Design a protein around this motif. Structure first.
Motif, PDB file in Angstrom:
ATOM      1  N   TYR A  53     157.795  16.529   0.516  1.00 21.25           N
ATOM      2  CA  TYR A  53     157.873  16.173   1.645  1.00 21.25           C
ATOM      3  C   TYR A  53     158.413  14.584   2.010  1.00 21.25           C
ATOM      4  CZ  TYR A  53     155.793  20.574   3.263  1.00 21.25           C
ATOM      5  OH  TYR A  53     155.225  21.820   3.348  1.00 21.25           O
ATOM      6  N   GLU A  54     159.569  14.234   1.759  1.00 19.20           N
ATOM      7  CA  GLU A  54     160.171  13.223   1.860  1.00 19.20           C
ATOM      8  C   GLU A  54     159.959  12.657   3.156  1.00 19.20           C
ATOM      9  OE1 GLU A  54     164.362  12.427  -0.084  1.00 19.20           O
ATOM     10  OE2 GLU A  54     163.118  10.687  -0.412  1.00 19.20           O
ATOM     11  N   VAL A  55     158.939  11.854   3.622  1.00 23.66           N
ATOM     12  CA  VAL A  55     158.646  11.595   4.877  1.00 23.66           C
ATOM     13  C   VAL A  55     159.658  10.156   5.334  1.00 23.66           C
ATOM     14  CG1 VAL A  55     156.623  12.226   6.017  1.00 23.66           C
ATOM     15  CG2 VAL A  55     156.482  10.933   3.872  1.00 23.66           C
ATOM     16  N   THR A  56     160.822  10.456   5.743  1.00 25.55           N
ATOM     17  CA  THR A  56     161.692   9.492   6.236  1.00 25.55           C
ATOM     18  C   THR A  56     161.050   8.540   7.520  1.00 25.55           C
ATOM     19  OG1 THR A  56     163.733  10.380   5.372  1.00 25.55           O
ATOM     20  CG2 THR A  56     164.173   8.942   7.149  1.00 25.55           C
ATOM     21  N   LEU A  57     160.972   7.198   7.308  1.00 26.36           N
ATOM     22  CA  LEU A  57     160.522   6.604   8.352  1.00 26.36           C
ATOM     23  C   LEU A  57     161.556   5.734   9.127  1.00 26.36           C
ATOM     24  CD1 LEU A  57     157.282   6.365   6.882  1.00 26.36           C
ATOM     25  CD2 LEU A  57     157.323   4.741   8.442  1.00 26.36           C
ATOM     26  N   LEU A  58     161.315   5.948  10.286  1.00 25.07           N
ATOM     27  CA  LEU A  58     162.598   5.365  11.350  1.00 25.07           C
ATOM     28  C   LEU A  58     161.781   4.214  12.157  1.00 25.07           C
ATOM     29  CD1 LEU A  58     163.227   8.566  13.292  1.00 25.07           C
ATOM     30  CD2 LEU A  58     162.423   8.340  10.961  1.00 25.07           C
ATOM     31  N   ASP A  59     160.593   4.480  12.434  1.00 28.87           N
ATOM     32  CA  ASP A  59     159.749   2.952  13.118  1.00 28.87           C
ATOM     33  C   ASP A  59     159.162   2.214  12.347  1.00 28.87           C
ATOM     34  OD1 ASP A  59     158.924   2.239  16.038  1.00 28.87           O
ATOM     35  OD2 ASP A  59     157.150   2.701  14.980  1.00 28.87           O
TER      36      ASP A  59
ATOM     37  N   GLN C  50     155.995  13.350  13.516  1.00 33.36           N
ATOM     38  CA  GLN C  50     157.358  13.706  13.596  1.00 33.36           C
ATOM     39  C   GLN C  50     158.025  12.660  14.434  1.00 33.36           C
ATOM     40  OE1 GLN C  50     159.527  17.346  12.479  1.00 33.36           O
ATOM     41  NE2 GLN C  50     158.705  17.905  14.536  1.00 33.36           N
ATOM     42  N   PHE C  52     158.498   9.681  14.133  1.00 35.85           N
ATOM     43  CA  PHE C  52     159.402   8.709  13.290  1.00 35.85           C
ATOM     44  C   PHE C  52     159.271   9.207  11.928  1.00 35.85           C
ATOM     45  CE2 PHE C  52     159.553   6.774  17.491  1.00 35.85           C
ATOM     46  CZ  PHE C  52     160.732   6.363  17.559  1.00 35.85           C
ATOM     47  N   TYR C  53     158.841  10.179  11.517  1.00 35.98           N
ATOM     48  CA  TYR C  53     158.625  10.518  10.093  1.00 35.98           C
ATOM     49  C   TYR C  53     159.121  11.939   9.631  1.00 35.98           C
ATOM     50  CZ  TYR C  53     155.121   6.701   9.344  1.00 35.98           C
ATOM     51  OH  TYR C  53     154.523   5.749   9.584  1.00 35.98           O
ATOM     52  N   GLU C  54     160.622  11.726   9.638  1.00 34.40           N
ATOM     53  CA  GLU C  54     161.258  13.159   9.447  1.00 34.40           C
ATOM     54  C   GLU C  54     160.901  13.668   8.186  1.00 34.40           C
ATOM     55  OE1 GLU C  54     163.934  14.723  10.683  1.00 34.40           O
ATOM     56  OE2 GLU C  54     165.639  13.686  11.028  1.00 34.40           O
ATOM     57  N   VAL C  55     160.024  14.504   7.976  1.00 35.41           N
ATOM     58  CA  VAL C  55     159.382  15.407   6.768  1.00 35.41           C
ATOM     59  C   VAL C  55     160.558  16.074   6.067  1.00 35.41           C
ATOM     60  CG1 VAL C  55     157.150  15.422   6.707  1.00 35.41           C
ATOM     61  CG2 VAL C  55     158.432  16.690   8.612  1.00 35.41           C
ATOM     62  N   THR C  56     161.267  15.518   5.138  1.00 35.90           N
ATOM     63  CA  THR C  56     162.353  16.148   4.433  1.00 35.90           C
ATOM     64  C   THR C  56     161.954  16.966   3.348  1.00 35.90           C
ATOM     65  OG1 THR C  56     164.089  14.462   4.746  1.00 35.90           O
ATOM     66  CG2 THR C  56     164.259  15.578   2.777  1.00 35.90           C
TER      67      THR C  56
END
Lengths: 60, 56, 60, 56
Positions: A53-59, C50, C52-56
């Protein structure tokens, strides 16, 4: 990382025990934070999420 | 819970070597933990840890 | 999605009330499923993440 | 708690129109919910929902 997190939070626990009681009581509190936050029932769950679950952070 | 999840990690991350100083924990072990705390994904587990824990 | 989820689970709630009691009892259970899973304490948790945490996802 | 996350959403999803059939809710409202369930990320929401809720 799960094994590193436990060995990390475990090491920290032993470190704090042998850290404070001298001149770093506050520092002891810091280590404790890392321990509780580490062994936290929720924290561990998230660590598992990392499995796929690659959690991509933006904030961040 | 959100602050210490990262803040706390940074405190022990900086004092880690100070700890070895007055504990003899060995810089080797300290280095391993620095990595355990240096990881970026970890901050995700920490930030998320507080998010759900503080979501209710 | 948070507002769409509550409006969805809310709509479903009213739907089940006016759904079953005719010939869709089981289906009623289905609606409540979406209702509980939606309004669940954990559910609102990942939704907030979600933000700011795009779960890839990659394997699950 | 992980099966209905998709089973319940998908089952109720197909029932939505059946509901309008015997409820007169609102075909428009039904479509809105179909999107509320069609959302790909949503499936991730319920999946993780039980994942953490079950592991805890």
């Amino acid at each position: 990382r799960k094994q590193d997190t436990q060995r990390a939070l475990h090491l920290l626990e032993e470190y704090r025990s042998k850290l404070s009681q001298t001149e770093d009581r506050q520092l002891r509190s810091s280590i404790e934070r890392v321990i509780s936050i580490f062994q936290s029932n929720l924290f561990q769950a998230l660590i598992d999420i990392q499995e796929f679950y690659e959690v991509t952070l933006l904030d961040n | 819970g959100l602050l210490a999840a990262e803040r706390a990690v940074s405190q022990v991350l900086d004092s880690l070597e100070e700890i070895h100083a007055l504990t003899d924990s060995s810089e080797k072990d300290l280095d391993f933990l620095h990595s355990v705390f240096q990881d970026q994904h970890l901050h995700t587990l920490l930030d998320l840890y507080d998010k759900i824990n503080t979501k209710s």
